[PDB]
Amino acid sequence: CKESTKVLVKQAHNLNLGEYALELKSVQSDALESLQVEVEVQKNIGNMKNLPVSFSMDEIQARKRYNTPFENVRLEYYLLDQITAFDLIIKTSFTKKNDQGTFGETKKVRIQCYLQLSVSVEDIFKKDIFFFKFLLNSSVREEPVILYSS
Amino acid sequence: GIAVCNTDMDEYVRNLVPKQLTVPVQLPGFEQFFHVQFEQMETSHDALHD
Amino acid sequence: VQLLLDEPKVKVGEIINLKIITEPTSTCRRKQNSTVNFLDIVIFDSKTSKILPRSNRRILYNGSLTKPISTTKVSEINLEIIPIEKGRYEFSVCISKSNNQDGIIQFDSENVILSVI
């Protein structure tokens, strides 16, 4: 037993590139919270997990508040629900297992996915002509949003 | 302050795309009216604007 | 500053690019610090009493009007004055250097008027 309770450097390995791994993110979704994993591998990568590593399960599933681990799924959309929070956690594990080596990982990501571009409307209505006027606002305070089509 | 940040933007900026609905929310009763008027002098004409 | 416009005599349901043209000066040599300088565009009724940012049923536009210029060269700018149910408007600018209050340093007097039938 090393008995190193303190007084050292602890951990000495790096998550470098040029290796088959997993990457979970979120983009391009219309007002209903989701996620999107990505698998940049080759030659029959195996199944993977997607746990719900929360304290009280605010990042809920639809009917039963499940984790629903995938199987040979690279990109999907975990259409969750929202039981009153603005922060989460997600322990994600993936048995890679390329060739004669049971390759695994466990990344405990912390994605929080409240909306940003909070948009309100107003119409005006004249005789046989019609106009909307759209209000555009950022749901967070003093973190800015650039915007380049509408 | 402004180092022309659109010059080095397009290489690495990801393109998020929210796409909300739009209700065209309205009511339903069409009719018309036309009231006509003629001003009666109080003080002097004040140059009324619509 | 000059103000270059398409027409002064537009009907109601029509879209107009407005084009201000600004000329920074030799006597910007006092500062050089904020090369970016924030203007505004304010719309007056050609009686008194300018319309608010929420120009409801009067004038319509694309984006916030603040629309910066350089202290470098002849920058241009734009809006899209989508007119609605009006007559005899007025456009003029001011220069604000910053975003805060009491940042405003000059008020130009170039007042191009247009009519709406």
UniProtKB/Swiss-Prot annotation, chain B:
Coiled coil: none annotated. It is found in: Golgi apparatus. Part of the multisubunit TRAPP (transport protein particle) II complex composed of BET3, BET5, TRS20, TRS23, TRS31, TRS33, TRS65, TRS120 and TRS130. Interacts with YPT31 and YPT32. Present with 432 molecules/cell in log phase SD medium. Belongs to the TMEM1 family. Specific subunit of the TRAPP II complex, a highly conserved vesicle tethering complex that functions in the late Golgi as a guanine nucleotide exchange factor (GEF) for the Golgi YPT1 GTPase. TRS130 plays a role in the YPT GEF activity of TRAPP II in concert with the two other TRAPP II-specific subunits TRS65 and TRS120. Required for both the cytoplasm-to-vacuole targeting (Cvt) pathway and starvation-induced autophagy through its role in ATG8 and ATG9 trafficking. This is Trafficking protein particle complex II-specific subunit 130. The chain holds residues 953 to 1002 of 1102 of the full protein.
From Swiss-Prot, chain C:
It comes from the Eukaryota. It is found in: Golgi apparatus, cis-Golgi network. Specific subunit of the TRAPP II complex, a highly conserved vesicle tethering complex that functions in the late Golgi as a guanine nucleotide exchanger (GEF) for the Golgi YPT1 GTPase. TRS120 plays a role in the YPT GEF activity of TRAPP II in concert with the two other TRAPP II-specific subunits TRS65 and TRS130. Present with 259 molecules/cell in log phase SD medium. Belongs to the TRS120 family. Part of the multisubunit TRAPP (transport protein particle) II complex composed of BET3, BET5, TRS20, TRS23, TRS31, TRS33, TRS65, TRS120 and TRS130. Interacts directly with TRS65. This is Trafficking protein particle complex II-specific subunit 120. It comes from Saccharomyces cerevisiae (strain ATCC 204508 / S288c). The chain holds residues 1173 to 1289 of 1289 of the full protein.
